[PDB]
């Protein structure tokens, strides 16, 4: 029927950390004002990417139990979930945070930045697909926390300790789906987005092959 006091606590802590995330106004302004060319457009995206990583590192550190993990496991989680967590954040920015005029200018910059349509087309399909679900802020926060605390990233020493942090989050999300949408396939649809995000590791890897970025981007990718 409802979340236990322990599950409410976990959700509260995650929501707090999710709400403290902010895309600077300086960045939204650049989307609107900066010169329109492949080099300038690619440079704005590079800036947005660096900021997403900074925002996601700050969110991750505050996740319940993340700090109890080994420091080397903490880095493997950040490096392994980067691409996936960024797309999830960029989808929320594109679908919910930006005004309708700004989204249009951003799409125009994305499509004219040197990045292949082979990458850009499933990105926008994913954006439309996540937009269709009409996800609450709780669902975006929990999915982001679930993506980050994935126990099957490369170079994780203590996978079991990571599982113990991810599993109660999966339990909370399913319970929320039952409470908010008592549409019984809503959880399965959210899981579908998790597997859809995984395909982006492949499109990003093929893009990287063809220090044009930032030191944080070179380190995390």
């Amino acid at each position: 029927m409802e979340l236990t006091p322990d599950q409410q606590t976990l959700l509260h802590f995650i929501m707090d950390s999710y709400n403290k995330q902010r895309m600077p106004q300086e960045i939204t302004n650049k989307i609107l004002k900066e010169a329109f060319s492949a080099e300038e457009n690619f440079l704005i995206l590079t800036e947005m990417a660096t900021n997403h990583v900074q925002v996601l590192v700050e969110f991750t550190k505050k996740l319940p139990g993340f700090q109890t993990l080994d420091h080397e496991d903490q880095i493997a989680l950040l490096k392994g979930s980067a691409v996936e967590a960024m797309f999830l954040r960029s989808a929320e920015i594109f679908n919910k945070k930006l005004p309708s005029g700004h989204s249009d200018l951003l799409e125009a910059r994305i499509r004219n930045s040197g990045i292949s349509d082979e990458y850009i087309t499933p990105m926008f399909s994913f954006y439309k697909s996540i937009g269709e679900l009409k996800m609450t802020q709780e669902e975006y926060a929990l999915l982001t926390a679930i993506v980050i605390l994935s126990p099957d990233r490369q170079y994780i020493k203590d996978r079991e300790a990571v599982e113990k942090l991810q599993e109660p989050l999966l339990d909370v999300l399913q319970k929320l789906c039952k409470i908010h949408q008592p549409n019984p396939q809503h959880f399965a649809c959210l899981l579908g987005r998790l597997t859809e995000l995984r395909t982006f590791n492949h499109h990003h890897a093929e893009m990287l092959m063809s220090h044009k970025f930032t030191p944080l981007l070179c380190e995390i990718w």
Binding site: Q54, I75, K79, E219
Partner: peptide
């Protein structure tokens, strides 16, 4: 390796 990443992780 991961010097910038470690810094953001260890700050406060």
């Amino acid at each position: 390796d991961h010097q910038l990443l470690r810094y953001l992780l260890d700050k406060d």
